[PDB]
Amino acid sequence: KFVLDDRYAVASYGPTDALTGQPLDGKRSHGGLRLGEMEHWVLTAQGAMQTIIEKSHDDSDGCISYICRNCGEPAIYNASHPIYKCMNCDVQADIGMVDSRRSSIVFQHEMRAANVNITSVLSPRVFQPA
């Protein structure tokens, strides 16, 4: 066992998985290292949520998913090329940008494939009494 073989350091950019969008596994693949669910439990216990955002969203898969408030289904939004469309509502579409992970997006798409409709209830808007 040699230290030079065991050591590994990786920067922000590298190969990513095609399906989940996460870094490829291990040093052999030139990808990132794993923060299993035990590390997540420890970070949760310490209350370190900005660290969890930094590691599991920015460094790992992280994406702005657009959901229509009116129907709670994933919608189509593109700013550069103007696209503001919802397949279900058509007009009356109300797109909101939630922060999510490509892994969760793939999970929801898999669940929908099995004929299980997923509706996301966006948090209500809150206004001052004024």
Partner: protein, 435 residues
């Protein structure tokens, strides 16, 4: 050899509930235990001043007395599950090196040599069995503990402390107050309560103040006695529904009032103070007001200023610290303390109490899961070595699984009951208890 000679003549008569083989094995195991006198020669051959191994063992840096006795003066009997080496090789045989139904102790795992002296082949083999058993038990316990830890984490993770310092899952209350005192595990110190074990006359002599004839000090002593009685009643009742729990005067509290008082006294330039009725009465009034307002630590300072009603459970939570403050800031115990020093002491006490509270977003469920899961590995090892107990199958994760899986009474193993005799007069007679 004497036990074996008894066996040949058939003198061994096992007691009720034990077979002849079991009684013989127990007698042999007891007979082969090393005495404490084994340490006499060891301590005679080593100079404690200039012995590195002994200095490391005694100072607690590394090692233990059994390690020294094994390295020098003999390993002794090898025990697996509190049992000698069972005849696995063949019917009546333990190894190929010993005859069938061998009677000598060496044939069942008794090592007369030390590691320094050198172990023969059978002794080495028996040691190998024991070491491999330790390793296998450690691995099994690690795996089982990890499994139970994952299950417990997913069963408890939803519990989070809210803005009322309660514990709830999706607004459904799990605890009215976290820990029943609302404190962080890392902000506690063990402190002894002086009045718990004191007699009535001793309590009066040590805590009643007689310098001033005002009934306020009578009220203070009455409060001290009432709190002592409450503590005694509660913890005697606690010890009455547990197998072996015993009343203890030491409790974990967020603030060590005695240390604060000592530190202020140490830095006090005035030293011994003259007698001043006004100062004594003012100090007593300040202490009483602080004790009354203590529960407002959980509630705002605004509510303390407004003197709004306090919920009962918050008063119960503050009761223990109220008792400690009463004991440690009694008039007799604070006589060389000025009013300003008392105010500073109270301010420091309140600051420490506020700093010892639990935060408003703590995932206490995960903390509890980790804390309860960590000692389970060592518990598994100890329980495996707890097979000596007869009639109860507590070995392994059987009992933790029974507790956590909520198994019915029928599925439970190692069930036990502790029954007390009818009256406290006949409970001191052993013959009646046996009857």
């Amino acid at each position: 050899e004497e036990i074996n000679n008894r066996l040949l003549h058939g003198d061994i008569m096992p007691p009720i509930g034990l077979t002849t083989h079991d009684f013989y094995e127990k007698l042999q195991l007891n007979a082969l235990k090393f005495p404490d006198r084994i340490l006499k020669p060891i301590m005679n051959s080593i100079n404690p001043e200039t012995n590195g191994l002994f200095q490391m063992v005694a100072t607690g840096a590394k090692g233990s007395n059994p390690n020294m006795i094994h390295i020098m003066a003999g390993i002794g009997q090898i025990e697996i599950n509190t049992q000698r080496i069972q005849p696995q090789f063949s019917f009546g045989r333990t190894l190929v090196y010993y005859p069938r139904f061998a009677l000598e102790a060496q044939a069942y795992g008794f090592i007369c040599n030390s590691y320094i002296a050198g172990l023969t082949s059978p002794e080495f083999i028996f040691g190998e069995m024991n070491g491999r058993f330790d390793l296998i038990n450690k691995a099994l316990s690690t795996s089982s503990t990890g499994y139970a830890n994952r299950k417990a984490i997913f069963g408890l993770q939803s519990c989070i402390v809210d803005y009322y310092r309660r514990v709830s899952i999706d607004t459904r209350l799990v605890q009215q107050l976290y820990g029943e005192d609302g404190l962080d595990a890392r902000q506690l110190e063990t402190v002894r309560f002086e009045t718990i074990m004191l007699s009535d006359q001793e309590l009066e002599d040590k805590f009643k103040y007689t310098g001033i004839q005002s009934p306020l000090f009578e009220e203070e002593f009455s409060r001290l006695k009432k709190d002592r009685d409450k503590y005694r009643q509660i913890f005697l009742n606690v010890e009455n529904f547990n197998f072996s729990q015993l009343l203890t005067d030491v409790r974990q509290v967020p603030v060590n009032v005695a240390s604060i008082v000592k530190n202020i006294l140490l830095s006090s330039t005035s030293g011994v103070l003259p007698f001043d009725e006004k100062s004594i009465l003012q100090k007593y009034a300040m202490v009483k007001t602080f004790c009354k307002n203590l529960p407002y630590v959980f509630i705002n300072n605004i509510q303390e200023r407004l003197q709004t009603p306090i919920p009962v459970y918050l008063k119960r939570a503050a009761a223990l610290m109220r008792m400690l403050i009463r004991i440690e800031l009694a008039t007799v115990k604070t006589l060389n303390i000025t009013c300003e020093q008392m105010s500073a002491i109270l301010d420091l006490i309140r600051l420490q109490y506020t700093q010892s509270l639990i935060n408003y977003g703590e995932a206490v469920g995960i903390l509890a899961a980790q804390s309860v899961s960590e000692p389970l590995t060592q518990y598994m090892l100890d329980s495996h070595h707890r097979s000596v107990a007869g009639g109860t199958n507590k070995s392994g994760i059987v009992r933790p699984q029974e507790i956590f899986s909520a198994k019915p009474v029928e599925a439970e193993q190692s069930s036990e009951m502790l029954l007390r005799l009818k009256n406290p007069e006949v409970e001191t007679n052993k013959t009646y208890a046996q009857e």
